[PDB]
Design an enzyme around this catalytic site. Structure first.
Site, PDB file in Angstrom:
ATOM      1  N   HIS A 153      40.573  39.148  47.329  1.00 49.74           N
ATOM      2  CA  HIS A 153      39.821  38.357  48.292  1.00 49.74           C
ATOM      3  C   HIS A 153      38.334  38.183  48.059  1.00 49.74           C
ATOM      4  O   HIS A 153      37.737  37.270  48.614  1.00 49.74           O
ATOM      5  CB  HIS A 153      40.084  38.875  49.695  1.00 49.74           C
ATOM      6  CG  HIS A 153      41.509  38.713  50.119  1.00 49.74           C
ATOM      7  ND1 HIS A 153      41.962  39.059  51.374  1.00 49.74           N
ATOM      8  CD2 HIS A 153      42.592  38.267  49.441  1.00 49.74           C
ATOM      9  CE1 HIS A 153      43.264  38.838  51.448  1.00 49.74           C
ATOM     10  NE2 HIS A 153      43.670  38.359  50.290  1.00 49.74           N
ATOM     11  N   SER A 206      41.704  33.048  45.320  1.00 50.28           N
ATOM     12  CA  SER A 206      42.664  32.736  44.268  1.00 50.28           C
ATOM     13  C   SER A 206      42.099  31.871  43.158  1.00 50.28           C
ATOM     14  O   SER A 206      41.089  31.191  43.319  1.00 50.28           O
ATOM     15  CB  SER A 206      43.877  32.017  44.845  1.00 50.28           C
ATOM     16  OG  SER A 206      44.676  32.879  45.625  1.00 50.28           O
ATOM     17  N   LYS A 260      54.672  27.425  52.324  1.00 52.02           N
ATOM     18  CA  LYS A 260      55.058  27.371  50.918  1.00 52.02           C
ATOM     19  C   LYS A 260      55.691  28.688  50.489  1.00 52.02           C
ATOM     20  O   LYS A 260      56.699  28.693  49.809  1.00 52.02           O
ATOM     21  CB  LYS A 260      53.851  27.059  50.032  1.00 52.02           C
ATOM     22  CG  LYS A 260      54.225  26.610  48.630  1.00 52.02           C
ATOM     23  CD  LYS A 260      53.046  26.745  47.661  1.00 52.02           C
ATOM     24  CE  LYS A 260      53.368  26.209  46.264  1.00 52.02           C
ATOM     25  NZ  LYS A 260      53.598  24.719  46.225  1.00 52.02           N
ATOM     26  N   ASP A 261      55.121  29.813  50.888  1.00 50.88           N
ATOM     27  CA  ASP A 261      55.706  31.087  50.509  1.00 50.88           C
ATOM     28  C   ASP A 261      57.065  31.336  51.173  1.00 50.88           C
ATOM     29  O   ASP A 261      57.974  31.865  50.544  1.00 50.88           O
ATOM     30  CB  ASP A 261      54.744  32.219  50.836  1.00 50.88           C
ATOM     31  CG  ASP A 261      53.520  32.195  49.952  1.00 50.88           C
ATOM     32  OD1 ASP A 261      52.670  33.112  50.064  1.00 50.88           O
ATOM     33  OD2 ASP A 261      53.417  31.246  49.141  1.00 50.88           O
ATOM     34  N   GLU A 321      67.369  50.952  31.985  1.00 50.53           N
ATOM     35  CA  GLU A 321      67.670  49.687  32.662  1.00 50.53           C
ATOM     36  C   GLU A 321      67.012  48.488  31.953  1.00 50.53           C
ATOM     37  O   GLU A 321      65.959  48.622  31.303  1.00 50.53           O
ATOM     38  CB  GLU A 321      67.214  49.741  34.114  1.00 50.53           C
ATOM     39  CG  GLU A 321      68.036  50.648  34.989  1.00 50.53           C
ATOM     40  CD  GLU A 321      69.499  50.232  35.050  1.00 50.53           C
ATOM     41  OE1 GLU A 321      69.808  49.190  35.683  1.00 50.53           O
ATOM     42  OE2 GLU A 321      70.341  50.954  34.452  1.00 50.53           O
TER      43      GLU A 321
HETATM   44  C1  HEM Z   1      53.189  45.867  43.751  1.00 46.98           C
HETATM   45  C2  HEM Z   1      53.010  44.663  42.883  1.00 46.98           C
HETATM   46  C3  HEM Z   1      52.105  43.641  43.173  1.00 46.98           C
HETATM   47  C4  HEM Z   1      51.946  43.000  44.401  1.00 46.98           C
HETATM   48  C5  HEM Z   1      52.812  43.155  45.668  1.00 46.98           C
HETATM   49  C6  HEM Z   1      50.944  41.947  44.061  1.00 46.98           C
HETATM   50  C7  HEM Z   1      50.572  40.998  44.953  1.00 46.98           C
HETATM   51  C8  HEM Z   1      49.725  39.970  44.697  1.00 46.98           C
HETATM   52  C9  HEM Z   1      49.420  38.998  45.677  1.00 46.98           C
HETATM   53  C10 HEM Z   1      49.907  38.941  47.110  1.00 46.98           C
HETATM   54  C11 HEM Z   1      48.615  38.120  45.081  1.00 46.98           C
HETATM   55  C12 HEM Z   1      48.123  36.803  45.701  1.00 46.98           C
HETATM   56  C13 HEM Z   1      49.069  35.610  45.528  1.00 46.98           C
HETATM   57  C14 HEM Z   1      49.418  35.292  44.060  1.00 46.98           C
HETATM   58  O1  HEM Z   1      48.569  34.740  43.322  1.00 46.98           O
HETATM   59  O2  HEM Z   1      50.557  35.601  43.651  1.00 46.98           O
HETATM   60  C15 HEM Z   1      48.343  38.667  43.778  1.00 46.98           C
HETATM   61  C16 HEM Z   1      47.501  38.102  42.915  1.00 46.98           C
HETATM   62  C17 HEM Z   1      47.214  38.569  41.672  1.00 46.98           C
HETATM   63  N1  HEM Z   1      47.868  39.657  41.141  1.00 46.98           N
HETATM   64 FE1  HEM Z   1      49.235  40.814  41.890  1.00 46.98          FE
HETATM   65  N2  HEM Z   1      50.516  41.945  42.727  1.00 46.98           N
HETATM   66  C18 HEM Z   1      51.262  42.931  42.156  1.00 46.98           C
HETATM   67  C19 HEM Z   1      51.248  43.240  40.828  1.00 46.98           C
HETATM   68  C20 HEM Z   1      50.380  42.708  39.910  1.00 46.98           C
HETATM   69  C21 HEM Z   1      50.355  43.034  38.453  1.00 46.98           C
HETATM   70  C22 HEM Z   1      51.270  43.911  37.604  1.00 46.98           C
HETATM   71  C23 HEM Z   1      49.333  42.356  37.984  1.00 46.98           C
HETATM   72  C24 HEM Z   1      48.993  42.236  36.637  1.00 46.98           C
HETATM   73  C25 HEM Z   1      48.817  43.295  35.619  1.00 46.98           C
HETATM   74  C26 HEM Z   1      48.788  41.569  39.116  1.00 46.98           C
HETATM   75  C27 HEM Z   1      47.779  40.643  39.009  1.00 46.98           C
HETATM   76  C28 HEM Z   1      47.294  39.768  39.926  1.00 46.98           C
HETATM   77  C29 HEM Z   1      46.160  38.856  39.730  1.00 46.98           C
HETATM   78  C30 HEM Z   1      45.319  38.621  38.494  1.00 46.98           C
HETATM   79  C31 HEM Z   1      46.114  38.069  40.781  1.00 46.98           C
HETATM   80  C32 HEM Z   1      45.255  36.805  40.795  1.00 46.98           C
HETATM   81  C33 HEM Z   1      46.082  35.538  40.947  1.00 46.98           C
HETATM   82  C34 HEM Z   1      45.316  34.269  40.605  1.00 46.98           C
HETATM   83  O3  HEM Z   1      45.212  33.941  39.413  1.00 46.98           O
HETATM   84  O4  HEM Z   1      44.810  33.588  41.521  1.00 46.98           O
HETATM   85  N3  HEM Z   1      49.461  41.751  40.248  1.00 46.98           N
HETATM   86  N4  HEM Z   1      49.080  39.756  43.513  1.00 46.98           N
END
Ligand code: HEM
Ligand SMILES: CCCCCCCC/C=C\CCCCCCCC(=O)OC[C@H](COP(=O)(O)OCCN)OC(=O)CCCCCCC/C=C\CCCCCCCC
Ligand SMILES: CCCCCCCC/C=C\CCCCCCCC(=O)OC[C@H](COP(=O)(O)OCCN)OC(=O)CCCCCCC/C=C\CCCCCCCC
Ligand code: HEM
Lengths: 59, 49, 54, 271, 422, 101, 442
Positions: free
Chosen positions: D93, D97, D119-120, D163
């Site tokens: 935040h 995004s 959308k989600d 797995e």
């Molecule tokens: C428990 C697992 C995770 C949860 C629940 C989570 C959740 C989220 C959520 C809610 C967002 C905002 C919506 C979206 O862009 O999809 C987000 C964004 C993002 N997440 Fe995760 N995430 C997880 C794992 C990861 C992992 C493994 C990475 C990468 C190594 C990661 C990298 C990012 C990044 C870079 C954003 C920015 C998105 C953009 O480009 O605007 N997330 N994540």
């Protein structure tokens, strides 16, 4: 004057203060344990296995 | 006016060495700090153990 | 911002609630229970897990 | 978005530990055996190897004291995931995004609700369908039948493999003949994600306008698919070699090709 | 080893005067003097002179804003711009050893400003500030309104960028203002603490925006107005003047001497001024503390003269009246041949004292070398000062009492009088 | 020969950011320098880029692009920021280097 | 070359009169000059009951003597175009005149007549009493000096130095023709005075005119001995004068200084040369070399700030002062303490090299004219017991290096309990404790 010296060499630089806390702990442990163990045993003369062990120690 | 303002008397609280207003307090500083710090350094050692 | 304690999105949190947090000057020992309850909690969970593993 | 990203890698690592310990809980052939082979891997770490493992096991081999501490861990980790997710979104935040074109979207932002809430919720049902379709019509489509056999320490299964979601790395593990090197290679296979941010050379953020980087990207994906596949097959020709090849191309693409093709792309734009 | 050198002073084809004087001080103080200022501004570019003054540390074609500041500081140097309604001086100071270094930036600033749109844009809000600290001295507020009531143009133009124009000046306006005023025939490269040949080699083989007189300031037309600022301050400042003498004029020395006869500043700390007729006359009129002085300005094509008075509100009436009676009384032959001799000497001294300061000297030296091209010897300026009859003084006095007066005042003026009540 | 020119024009068309009506410089990732650079752009150029960018986003959200006619032609792509950005970097490197000495 | 221009600076002549007074001067080819007597007196030398006298005296020193009353005295000086000025600090008072060299002797006479025969007209006192009383009200609105006073007030709390140079309100309301007389007769004495001068004056013509009006001889050995003062004790403490009604806040922080004689003072100065000073009208802005100034600018930390090394005979104050808005006090302070720490732990050769040049240019400018030179002579003798020439100062400054600046600052700043004074809307600046900890770990 130890307090003066102590301050200078040990407590002034944060790095040396830390070194003191460690080495200080290492020595404090070694002595606090031996001492307390000592006290506990005297307070319990002849009751601990350590004490009566000899009677059956005979391989 | 600010000219009519003075710092109260802290003799009731001052440490023994900085009790006399005509003696450099710097000479006894390393002692006063060395003590307090000594207390602290010890608390760490105890905690560490 | 100058010092990291305030700018960082996380330290900023730790700061505004454990370091630069405004506290009355006259609170007594009766206010120590909040922290204890907190510590008390972390301790239960720790010993608890340890026990659960057996 | 470094911090959002780094916490991200942490979420992945945590999820892995979680799903790994989870799988042992039913104590089936594969549960036990996989646990025995995977955890023993650390024994290759010098000097403190064996010690660290026997500690983890709570004994001399995967036995009851392990099953219990794993159940404990499995119950615990998920909650840590939840916590960390809050941090993830918290860093997220700060910046807001990112978007497909990779250029500042301040000139055109919209309230999350209803646009994305809707959308989600749509994307939730679109995926949830295949999930349920599978979970309900072909239940064990993904599980090893070997796990319908109570763990038995006197019968090693023919092919002990983790797995699906782990194969890709299991694969890179066997690529390097040398218990120690292979472990590190494994570790690196995932820890490599922490370097991605420092290997960005393009003057642009996305690959939307970088066709070269695009094939390179899809190559890498395909590469992971193959690695996954190799992980599922035995350790014999022609697999062994394909394995090492894919494992090599994996690190080459992320460590050398990507940043390089990135730079070349800048020159072609007159940058 | 080091002794008595003699102030050299060349002049190049394009008209660029170069003054110099080695006094073997362990420190130098070079300085570009120029014929420019708010005097040349038009209703259309007001303030541009001011902003220009503040813009001195902005990037140039040979040095970046960063290098200009870091560069000068690296050698304990200093860089400043002082300017009146009709003159702008750019000078720098440093130790003998670093002159050649500090010189570059000095050169760059005055003859190579880039006035980048952004740099400028981000600098303008400064005027609001620089102008706000100056106006803390009521002293400065009335003088601005004075010139405004004293003229209809050129000089009536304020020294600090008017409020409405803040953030409306443009890089072009800055550029034009420079190209049209900072021209080789309006510039002098004065330099204390250096060998003339060195200072010369710099000027010629380096300075390039050149030739001509460029824009010419309209004649200073006298108005004779009265501006009053009601603000509530318990102290009322007031200044009443009359067109005075010009610079380089012979009627100049006359006023200066009349100035000192009336009273121009105290010489004794917290002391009363007995030698000050004006101060003394006022003293016998009001009872509460105050201050009164002989105001005297000499400009290129005109000047101003009269008095200036800081006084309590209610007693502003009594104080101004007095300051007047004392001026008419002077015109009505109320001056002693001694009064004139005392003055002449206070003037000689004051002049000679206000030259010990390296800055005061570089300033005296350059002022001439610009509006003349010469250096009047100290015995000459003296030979010129005393050569002023008792009459001359009483005549100056007359002129003030007869000429059209323009007044400017600020404070709780409720009891202060209007120009037509004196 | 014109090899380098053949390539560039090819890559320029290969990238395809011109189908959105964007200019090479419109796609620059806003890192610290590009940020300062933009602040220096004259208002008219800033507002224009802003429209272009906002227009591109709207196409993206719509999953469309501009009609072939409106695509930016390689040879008419104006490098509006590049000059500024270079000085911004020149400046930095000066400071970076100077603070070292 | 710079080097030579220094060597070629004429010497400062110093000769002592059989009565104890010291006459010093630097002769130049200048037609005008400045001569005056610099005295080793001041509020520090005062006590609880006469605090302010030295100032009340300053107010009468010019209102005429016995030989030639007010009107005459004033008239006689104005008429010769001479300027008569003077001042009084905690450990130093001085009256000096600016006039043509031609009157060097008639001046000397006047001086001697002022320090030796002040009128002290019973009727003048009761007037200057009302005058001083208003000067206090005007000064009370100058936060910068209200602050430094408080700084002292606590840094040296309970001692002689903790007193304001102007004095108490009571003290000024009741001081007497007597007390004033006594002060002068007790403090203004030859062995503790220096007749200094600079301009186009002949040491001889000066010293001669000296023996003539400064003839008073001493009999006993006591009269030849300068009394040593009981020293003042420093105290790490704070005083907070709050008033949210003031538009800005003023903060001053300092550790104890070494005192005039100590050589370290040179390095200490070289140090402050690094931190330097700022004020919203510095055009350098964000490019200024001073790290604190920059932050000040980049982050709008303050309206101004200054570093200082106020020295005294046996002690001193080494610290800084700044004016800021109620909501930027903390960051400002935070950054400030940062730089002090940077001095102690990581100064650079580049930093000092500059600081030096800035300092050199500083000392040289301190001698820009005759009054300033005379003020330097009048002081060097009174404090160092002699004259330190730019040629020397330079050598002492040139010898300073990073490794050196570090050791000293560490010696005087690191982990020391500082004295702090805050005035205004200082709510955001808080806790001595916190400030105390900003005294260690870069
Ligand atoms: C428990 C697992 C995770 C949860 C629940 C989570 C959740 C989220 C959520 C809610 C967002 C905002 C919506 C979206 O862009 O999809 C987000 C964004 C993002 N997440 Fe995760 N995430 C997880 C794992 C990861 C992992 C493994 C990475 C990468 C190594 C990661 C990298 C990012 C990044 C870079 C954003 C920015 C998105 C953009 O480009 O605007 N997330 N994540
Ligand atoms: C055998 C042992 C060998 C192993 C060694 C491990 C120990 C290593 C410890 C590193 C040393 C710490 C370095 C400290 C430096 C930071 C510092 O400033 O000091 C701490 C600083 C003190 O401030 P100053 O006195 O102003 O210091 C001035 C310095 N010139 O803050 C403190 O008060 C901390 C010290 C007190 C600790 C209090 C803890 C009390 C808790 C008790 C409960 C028991 C413990 C059980 C733990 C639960 C775990 C499940
Ligand atoms: C890791 C373990 C390996 C397991 C494999 C995971 C499952 C792999 C399934 C294959 C993926 C199928 C995806 C098909 C989508 C194809 C498609 O639409 O491509 C075109 C389209 C065009 O993009 P723009 O340039 O923005 O155009 C804008 C104009 N409107 O590209 C995209 O959608 C962007 C790519 C995002 C999808 C990437 C998903 C692949 C996932 C695999 C993991 C790889 C990463 C590294 C993991 C390390 C552990
Ligand atoms: C909120 C803090 C907790 C409280 C107040 C609490 C309280 C208790 C109580 C009263 C018992 C009975 C102890 C006895 O007499 O035998 C107990 C047992 C136990 N708790 Fe907790 N507990 C807490 C947290 C946890 C957690 C977080 C775990 C681990 C996930 C845990 C695991 C267990 C286990 C395994 C036992 C059974 C073994 C035993 O009885 O000693 N507890 N707890």
């Amino acid at each position: 004057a130890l307090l003066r010296q102590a301050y200078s060499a040990l407590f002034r630089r944060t790095s040396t203060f830390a070194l003191t806390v460690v080495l200080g702990a290492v020595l404090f442990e070694r002595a606090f344990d031996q001492g307390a163990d000592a006290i506990f045993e005297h307070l319990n003369e002849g009751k601990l296995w350590k004490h009566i062990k000899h009677k059956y120690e005979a391989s | 006016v600010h000219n009519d303002v003075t710092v109260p008397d802290f003799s009731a609280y001052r440490r023994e060495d900085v009790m006399d207003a005509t003696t450099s307090s710097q000479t006894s500083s390393e002692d006063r700090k060395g003590f307090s710090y000594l207390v602290t350094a010890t608390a760490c050692v105890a905690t560490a153990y | 911002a100058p010092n990291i304690r305030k700018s960082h999105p996380l330290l900023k949190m730790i700061n505004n609630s454990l370091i630069d947090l405004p506290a009355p000057s006259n609170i007594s020992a009766w206010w120590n229970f909040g922290s204890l309850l907190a510590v008390c909690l972390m301790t239960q969970i720790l010993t608890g897990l340890l026990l659960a593993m057996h | 978005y470094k911090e959002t990203w780094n916490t991200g890698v942490i979420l992945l690592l945590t999820l892995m530990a979680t799903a790994f310990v989870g799988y042992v809980l039913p104590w089936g052939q594969m549960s036990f055996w996989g646990a025995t082979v995977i955890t023993n891997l650390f024994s290759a770490i010098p000097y403190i190897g064996h010690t660290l493992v026997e500690w983890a096991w709570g004994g001399f081999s995967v036995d009851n004291p392990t099953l219990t501490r794993f159940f404990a861990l499995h119950f615990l980790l998920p909650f840590a995931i939840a916590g960390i997710t809050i941090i993830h979104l918290t860093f997220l935040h700060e910046s807001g995004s990112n978007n497909p074109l990779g250029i500042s979207s301040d000139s055109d932002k919209i309230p999350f609700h209803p646009y994305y809430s809707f959308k989600d919720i749509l994307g939730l049902t679109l995926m949830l369908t295949p999930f349920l379709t599978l979970a309900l019509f072909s239940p064990n489509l993904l599980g090893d039948p070997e796990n319908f056999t109570p763990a038995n320490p006197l019968v090693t299964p023919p092919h002990i493999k983790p797995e699906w979601y782990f194969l890709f790395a299991y694969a890179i593990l066997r690529s390097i003949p040398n218990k120690l090197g292979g472990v590190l290679a494994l570790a690196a296979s995932v820890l490599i994600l922490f370097l991605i941010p420092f290997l960005h050379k393009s003057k642009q953020r996305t690959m939307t306008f970088r066709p070269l980087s695009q094939t390179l990207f899809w190559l890498l994906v395909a590469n992971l698919l193959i690695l996954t596949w190799i992980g599922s097959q035995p350790v014999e020709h022609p697999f062994i070699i394909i394995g090492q090849m894919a494992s090599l191309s994996y690190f080459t693409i992320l460590l050398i090709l990507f940043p390089t093709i990135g730079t070349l792309e800048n020159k072609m734009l007159n940058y | 080893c080091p002794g008595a050198e003699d102030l050299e002073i060349t002049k190049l084809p394009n008209g660029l005067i170069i003054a110099s004087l080695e006094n073997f001080s362990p420190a130098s103080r070079i300085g570009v003097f120029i014929k420019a200022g708010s005097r040349y501004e038009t209703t259309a570019n007001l303030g541009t002179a001011h902003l220009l003054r503040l813009a001195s540390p902005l990037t140039t074609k040979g040095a970046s804003s960063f290098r200009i500041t870091r560069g000068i500081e690296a050698v304990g140097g200093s860089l400043s711009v002082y300017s009146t309604r009709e003159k702008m001086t750019y000078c720098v100071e440093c130790l003998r050893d670093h002159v050649d270094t500090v010189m570059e930036y000095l050169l760059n600033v005055t003859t190579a400003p880039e006035f980048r749109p952004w740099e400028v844009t981000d600098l303008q809000p400064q005027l609001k500030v620089d102008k706000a600290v100056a106006f803390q001295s009521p002293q400065v507020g009335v003088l601005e309104n004075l010139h405004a009531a004293a003229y209809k143009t050129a000089l009536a133009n304020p020294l600090y960028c008017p409020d409405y124009r803040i953030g409306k000046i443009t890089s072009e306006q800055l550029h034009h203002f420079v190209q049209n005023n900072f021209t080789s025939a309006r510039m002098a490269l004065v330099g204390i603490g250096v060998k003339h040949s060195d200072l010369k080699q710099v000027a010629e083989q380096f300075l390039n925006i050149r030739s001509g007189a460029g824009t010419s300031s309209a004649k200073a037309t006298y108005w004779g107005g009265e501006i009053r600022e009601q603000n509530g301050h318990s102290l009322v400042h007031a200044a009443v003047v009359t067109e005075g003498a010009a610079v380089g004029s012979a009627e100049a020395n006359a006023f200066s001497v009349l100035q000192h006869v009336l009273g121009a500043g105290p010489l004794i700390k917290r002391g009363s001024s007995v030698t000050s007729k004006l101060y003394q006359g006022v003293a016998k009129a009001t009872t509460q503390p105050f201050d009164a002085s002989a105001f005297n300005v000499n400009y290129s094509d005109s000047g101003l003269f009269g008095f200036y008075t800081i006084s309590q509100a209610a007693h502003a009436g009594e104080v101004i009246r007095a300051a007047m009676n004392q001026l008419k009384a002077a015109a009505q032959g109320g001056v002693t041949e001694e009064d004139v001799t005392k003055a002449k000497n206070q003037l000689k001294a004051t002049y000679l004292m206000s030259v010990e300061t390296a800055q005061g000297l570089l300033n005296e030296i350059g002022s001439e070398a610009l509006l003349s091209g010469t250096h009047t010897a100290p015995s000459v300026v003296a030979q010129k000062i005393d050569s002023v009859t008792s009459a001359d003084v009483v005549n100056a006095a007359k002129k003030f009492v007869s000429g059209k007066k323009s007044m400017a005042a600020s404070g709780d003026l409720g009891s202060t009088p209007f120009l037509d009540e004196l | 020969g014109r090899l380098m020119d053949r390539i560039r024009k090819w890559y320029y068309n290969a990238a395809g950011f011109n189908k959105y009506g964007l200019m090479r410089d419109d796609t620059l990732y806003e890192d610290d320098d590009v940020k300062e650079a933009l602040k220096r752009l004259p208002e008219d150029l800033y507002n224009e880029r802003m429209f272009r960018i906002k227009r591109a986003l709207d196409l993206s959200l719509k999953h469309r692009i501009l009609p072939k006619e409106q695509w930016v032609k390689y040879e008419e792509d104006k490098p509006y920021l590049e000059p500024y950005l270079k000085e911004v970097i020149r400046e930095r490197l000066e400071r970076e280097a100077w603070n070292k000495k | 070359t710079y080097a030579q221009t220094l060597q070629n600076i004429p010497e400062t002549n110093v000769t002592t009169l059989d009565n104890g007074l010291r006459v010093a001067s630097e002769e130049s080819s200048q037609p005008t000059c400045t001569v005056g007597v610099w005295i080793g007196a001041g509020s520090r030398y005062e006590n609880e009951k006469n605090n302010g006298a030295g100032y009340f005296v300053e107010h009468l020193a010019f209102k005429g003597t016995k030989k030639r009353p007010c009107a005459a005295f004033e008239k006689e000086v104005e008429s010769m175009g001479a300027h008569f000025n003077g001042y009084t600090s905690r450990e130093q008072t001085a009256f000096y005149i600016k006039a043509l060299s031609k009157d060097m002797p008639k001046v000397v006479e006047l001086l001697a007549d002022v320090v030796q025969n002040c009128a002290l007209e019973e009727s003048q006192i009761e007037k200057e009493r009302g005058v001083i009383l208003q000067e206090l009200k005007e000064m009370d609105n100058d936060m910068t000096n209200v602050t430094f006073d408080y700084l002292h007030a606590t840094a040296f709390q309970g001692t002689a130095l903790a007193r304001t140079v102007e004095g108490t309100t009571e003290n000024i309301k009741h001081l007497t023709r007597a007390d004033l007389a006594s002060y002068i007769d007790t403090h203004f004495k030859a062995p503790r005075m220096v007749l200094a001068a600079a301009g186009g004056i002949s040491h001889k013509e000066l010293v001669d005119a000296a023996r003539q009006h400064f003839s008073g001889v001493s009999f006993t050995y006591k009269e030849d001995a300068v009394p040593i003062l009981p020293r003042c004790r420093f105290t790490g403490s704070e005083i907070r004068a709050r008033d949210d009604a003031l538009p800005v806040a003023h903060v001053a922080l300092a550790v104890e200084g070494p005192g005039w004689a100590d050589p370290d003072n040179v390095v200490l100065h070289v140090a402050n040369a690094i931190i330097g000073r700022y004020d919203r009208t510095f055009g350098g802005g964000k490019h200024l070399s001073s790290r604190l100034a920059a932050l000040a600018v980049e982050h709008k930390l303050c309206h101004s700030f200054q570093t200082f090394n106020t020295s005294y005979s046996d002690t001193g104050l080494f610290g800084f002062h700044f004016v800021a808005d109620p909501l930027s006090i903390d960051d400002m302070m935070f950054c400030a303490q940062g730089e002090w720490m940077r001095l102690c732990t990581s100064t650079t050769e580049s930093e000092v090299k500059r600081a030096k040049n800035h300092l050199r240019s500083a000392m040289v400018a301190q001698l820009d004219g005759t009054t300033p030179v005379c003020e330097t002579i009048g002081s060097h003798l009174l404090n160092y017991g002699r004259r330190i020439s730019l040629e020397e100062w330079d050598s002492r400054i040139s010898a300073v290096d990073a490794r050196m600046v570090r050791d000293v600052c560490s010696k005087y700043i690191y982990d020391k309990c500082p004295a702090l004074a805050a005035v205004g809307p200082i709510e955001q600046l808080l806790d001595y404790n916190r400030i105390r900890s900003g005294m260690y770990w870069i």
